[PDB]
Design a binder for this molecule. Structure first.
Ligand SMILES: Clc1ncc(NCc2ccccc2)cc1-c1cccc2ncccc12
Ligand SMILES: Clc1ncc(NCc2ccccc2)cc1-c1cccc2ncccc12
Lengths: 94, 92
């Protein structure tokens, strides 16, 4: 316990941004990515299913009000967020 | 003033991507967490169907704003989490 005071439009695996809001959380608003397509954009600008768009996830630190509905008392929490998309081969080498 | 009660690589996307990336160690002993693993794109370009680097396309890092604790105050920093492939800006 302590005291405390456009490029994605040009991607071959493009995404949209989605508002993730939670007043019981700091930061209250987190911008999450959702891939537009299951395939990737090929050279003619069409979705190609020989490759797949996949979201990249990241574990983010967050402050959660503890106990519920407290203006100045928080607990440190980790959550998983989608930060963007990449284009991958659908097969795995494992 | 508020009261606060107090790295791995588990996905294979980094290697399966047309914009693959490596991880670099970002360490700060007066910070929580002290170690963060940041992505860096492997190539300037992206991998084509033949397995070769296409220098016309661009590999670019995906950044995310994250919360860290510094010796105790709260700070927001930007971190690279992966890379995507984009078509370049080719007009004014
Ligand atoms: Cl410009 C382009 N070039 C290649 C690809 N995918 C193929 C590829 C990926 C990696 C390495 C080699 C080749 C896609 C696009 C592309 C992206 C976004 C919008 C587009 N709108 C119209 C036309 C193309 C678009
Ligand atoms: Cl399998 C493959 N297929 C297509 C691409 N990029 C072209 C493309 C992108 C988007 C839409 C259409 C076409 C790249 C790869 C590829 C990716 C990763 C490693 C590889 N290692 C060897 C050979 C290919 C590899």
């Amino acid at each position: 316990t302590v005291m405390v005071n456009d490029y994605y439009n040009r991607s071959t695996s493009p995404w949209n941004l989605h508002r993730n809001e939670d007043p019981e959380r700091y930061p209250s608003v987190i911008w999450e990515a959702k891939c537009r397509h299951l395939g990737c954009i090929n050279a003619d600008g069409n979705v190609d299913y020989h490759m797949n768009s996949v979201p990249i996830q990241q574990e983010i630190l967050v402050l959660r009000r503890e106990p519920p509905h407290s203006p100045n008392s928080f607990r440190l929490e980790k959550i998983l967020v989608s930060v963007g998309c990449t284009c991958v081969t659908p097969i795995v080498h494992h």
